[PDB]
Unconditional design. Structure first.
Lengths: 349, 350, 347
C-alpha cells in the first residue's frame, strides 16, 4: 500500500523473556526497489526491565546506540581495558564493530528502551552478534572450537574449560542483576527551530566527529497536540523517522505519476522520508520523534510555507506570475498570510 | 552489436512543445553488463527556443549543467535569497540536489542547447524532478497535500490557495517570455593541454576545480579539423562519455575471451562511451568539436601509442622491443621516429 | 561445504608454457552470497622459470604485486620515461591501473613466484590485460585498428608496420631472456615469541596501502605452534599458505558452524571480520595475509595473557556470562602464560 511505512509489527523478535526483548526491523528493501539506498542499514529495538544485564557480545557491524527511554550503563571491553558510560534519555554513542559490550538497566522502576542503528559492511544488510554466553537458543562460540585447540589455547583440561566457560548457565542473553569518543545528547545544543508549537534539535556530521565517520544526522522532534510541521523537504538526507511518543498524521509526496503517501504513526512505527520528497507532519497528540538521516553531509532543509526559509518567497514576482495562475503580487500576498514558521496551528478554523 | 554506442534516437523525449524539448538518455546498463560502473549517471538534453523560461523545479540528483550552444540565465533559489548566473557557450556549473532553479534563453534569435549530467544518490540510476507548476502533463506537488494541511500551512482558505497556486495556468513546463522585454567556469578558461595544426584539447580535472573534485569528474572540449586524426591512446582511470557536439567523427575503439574492434561514424547528438584502459582513435570526417565527461577522473593519465611526445612504446628499450615485436630493436625505434607531430596528425590516405 | 576455502586447484590457468604460468583465482562470490564484500578483488599467481621475461602489458585494474619467492626486475613505463625496481622476496609495490610494465626473473637457478592482487573499478570483478605483443593465443591490440588509422598514425606504409609490430614473433607472453617498493618484514613484528612472528603493514603506516584500504601481514610459525582464538574488528583477511601446512578452525553463522580445513602450499582461506579464528602449524609454515576494509582494524584475542578481551570482563559480570564462579573464570584465563602463539601440542 505505502512502501515507505514500517509498522511496529514489521519488527522480527530475535529474542524475548520476562526480562526484556530484542527486535529487528526487516530490510528496508525487502518489499520495494525504492529504498536500494538504505540496504546497508538495519534498525533494532532493545526493551529491558529494571535491574537487567545484556550479556557480553560483539557485533560484526558498527552500531549507533540511542537511549529513547530510561537510563543505561554501557561497558565497552577492549584488549587493553574497559570504558564505562552512564547513558541518560537522549544520549547516543557509536559502538565500533568488533567491540564487545554489555548493557545494564540499573533503575529499580524505569524500563529501558534503546534504538540500535546498525551500519553493515562485512555482509551488507546483515547484522551478526557473537555472545560468549552458553544459553538455551545458542551456545558460546568458544564451544565451536575442537577439544585440542581449546585445551592448547587455555593450557587447561577440557573438563575444566567446559565446566568453567562452555556449559549452559543462563536461559537467555538478558539476565536479572544481583538483588541489590564519549556519549552525547540530542538536546545538548539549542534547537534549530523553536516556537510555541514545536522544537527541533539536530546534530549534523559537520558538528560531531562520531557522526562525520557514519555520514549521519540525528534530530529530536517535539510538538504539541494540533501543531503542524509545514511542508518541507531535505536536499540530501534520507530520514528514517521513529515515533517515540504520541501519534503523528504524516503526509509524504513523491513519484510517472504524482502520489501522496499518508499514515497515522503510533509509538514504535517508522516512516522513511526520501531526499527531495516534500513532507508535512501534524501532531494528533503531544509527540516527540527521533530522526536518523543518512547521506547527511551538506543536507539543507527547504520550506514551502511559513515566513522564514520559505524558498517560494525568494521567487521573484515576474517568474511567480508565469509559474502560478495567481498574479506575482497575489502569490506574494498569500505567502505573507502565515506569520509563524516551521511549526504552525494545524487545527481546523 | 556495439554496446558502447548510444545513437541520438536512444534519448527518451520527457517533454516537448513548440518552445523547446527535454530528452533523457536510457540507462548506460539497460542493454549490457559492460557498463555497471556508469549505472549511477544519466544524460539529458535541454533544447529551448529564444525568449523561453524553464519553470522552477528541484532535482533529487546533483546536476552538472554544461552549455553546448547559445547563452542562458540560470537562477538558483535558496531559503535565504537567490543567485543569478549568465552562462555563455562552454560554461558549466554544478547544481546541488534539492536546489530549486529556472532557466531562460534571452537571445532573440539563438536557440539554447544544454547538457545535464545527473549524479544520482537517492535512488541510483533515477532522476526525479519536482515542478511547483500546475501544467497539463503534471499538477503542482503542492496540490498532493490534503485540504486541511494546505489551509493550516498558508493560513488561507483552500479557495484562495487553489486559485493562486494549484490551478493550471501554463500548458507546459517550458513557456514563452512576455514581449516588450561556487561560480560557473568555461571549458576553455585554461590553455589547451594538446594544441597543434590539426586539433586542440582543453581539459578541467578534479585536481584543478573544486566543483569537479566533489563529483570525481573531468570535462574536456575537443576541437579538430576535417581529415585530422586523434592517434591511438587510452586513459588509465577515466571512463569518458563522449558527446558529438558539431561535425562527424570516424571512431575506432579496441576492447575484450576475444579481441574486438567497435567502430562507428558519430553525428551531432551521438554518444560513445570510452572505458578506462581501452585503446581509442578518432578521425574528423568534418571540422568537429566534441565534449567529454570522464568519471573516476581523479589521478587519470593519458598514454599514447603513436606520435613523438608521450608515446609509451618509445620508452621501451631496444633489448626488450626486439623480443616483444618481430622487428629488430632498431627497426622498431626507427618506425616510431617517422611520425613527427603528436596527439593530432594528418589522417589523410597516401 | 566450506565457502571460505579456495583450494590451489580453484586457480584458472590463463596462460602456460615451459617458461612459466599465469593463473587466476575464481571470483570470491562465484559460489556463495557470503563474500559479496570481496566481489571487486581478484587474486593471480605468476610462476616463471629462471631468465624469463613477461612481455609488456597494462591492466585495467590497480595491482598490488607481492614477491613470495625469488627476485624480480619490474619496469614501469610512463609517457615521460620508465622506472626500474629490483624486488627481493617479501617486497610489494602498487602498479597503478593503465601503467604498462614487464617482469624479468634474472636468477640463473631460482624460480619466480609473484602474487598479484587486482583491485577492479572499471568492470567490477574483471581484470583485462592488454599485451603489445602478437603471440599465438592473441594478436597485438594495435592490429585491431584499420589499415588507414595505423598508416596515418605512425606515418609509415602498412607493410613496414605489419612486419615490424603486428606479425607474430613470439609463441607466448612469457619468453626466455638472452612511490617505492617495501618489504613485509621492513618493520619489527607486532607479535613475536618462541612459537611465531607476525609482521603487519597497515594503511595507517604506508601511503601505497592507505589508497587501497588494505593491510598485509607475513605469518611465520614453528611446527606444533598454535595461533590462539582471535578475530579482526573490520579487516576481512585473504590468507595464502605460502610454505607448510596449517590446521585452520574458523567459527561463524541462525546456526553456529565451524569451518575447519588443512591448508597446503597454494591454498587460500578467507577470514571474515568478527569471525573467531585459530590456526595450528602442522609443519613450519609461513603465510601471507591481505586484509581489505583494513583502516582502523583491531585484533581481539580470546586466549593467552596479553590482549585477551575476556580477561578485561570483571568477575561480577563473568559469574553471570559463564557457568563458572567469577574467580573460577579469572583463574582459568591465567593458566596460559604465553600470548598470541602457544604450544599447540596435546597433553
Amino acid at each position: 500500500n505505502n512502501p515507505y511505512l514500517f509498522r511496529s509489527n514489521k519488527f522480527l523478535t530475535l529474542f524475548k523473556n520476562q526480562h526484556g526483548s530484542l527486535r529487528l526491523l526487516q530490510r528496508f528493501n525487502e518489499d520495494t526497489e525504492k529504498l536500494e539506498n538504505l540496504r546497508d542499514y538495519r534498525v533494532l529495538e532493545y526493551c529491558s526491565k529494571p535491574n537487567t544485564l545484556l550479556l557480553p557480545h560483539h557485533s560484526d557491524s558498527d552500531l549507533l546506540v540511542l537511549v529513547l527511554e530510561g537510563q543505561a550503563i554501557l561497558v565497552l571491553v577492549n584488549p587493553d581495558g574497559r570504558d564505562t558510560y552512564k547513558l541518560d534519555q537522549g544520549d547516543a554513542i557509536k559502538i565500533q564493530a568488533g567491540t564487545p559490550f554489555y548493557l545494564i538497566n540499573p533503575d529499580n522502576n524505569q524500563n529501558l528502551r534503546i534504538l540500535k542503528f546498525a551500519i553493515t559492511f562485512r555482509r551488507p544488510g546483515t547484522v551478526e552478534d557473537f555472545f560468549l554466553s552458553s544459553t538455551k537458543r545458542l551456545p558460546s562460540y568458544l564451544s565451536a572450537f575442537s577439544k585440542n585447540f581449546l585445551e592448547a589455547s587455555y593450557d587447561s583440561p577440557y573438563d575444566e574449560i567446559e565446566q568453567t566457560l562452555l556449559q549452559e548457565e543462563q536461559e537467555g542473553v538478558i539476565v536479572k542483576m544481583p538483588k541489590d569518543d564519549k556519549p552525547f545528547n540530542l538536546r545538548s545544543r539549542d534547537p534549530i527551530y523553536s516556537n510555541n508549537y514545536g522544537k527541533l534539535y539536530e546534530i549534523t556530521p559537520e558538528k560531531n566527529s562520531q557522526l562525520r565517520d557514519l555520514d549521519i544526522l540525528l534530530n529530536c522532534l517535539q510538538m504539541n497536540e494540533g501543531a503542524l510541521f509545514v511542508p518541507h523537504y531535505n536536499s540530501r538526507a534520507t530520514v528514517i523517522l521513529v515515533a517515540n511518543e504520541g501519534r503523528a498524521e504524516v503526509e509524504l509526496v513523491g513519484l510517472m505519476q504524482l502520489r501522496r503517501y499518508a499514515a497515522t504513526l503510533s509509538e514504535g512505527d517508522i516512516i522513511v522520508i526520501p531526499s527531495s520528497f516534500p513532507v508535512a507532519l501534524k501532531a494528533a497528540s503531544d509527540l516527540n520523534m527521533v530522526g536518523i538521516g543518512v547521506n547527511a553531509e551538506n543536507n539543507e532543509r527547504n520550506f514551502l510555507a511559513g515566513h522564514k526559509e520559505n524558498v517560494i518567497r525568494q521567487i521573484p514576482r515576474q517568474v511567480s506570475d508565469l509559474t502560478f495562475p495567481g498574479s506575482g503580487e497575489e502569490v506574494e500576498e498569500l505567502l505573507e498570510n502565515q506569520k509563524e514558521s516551521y511549526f504552525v496551528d494545524g487545527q481546523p478554523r
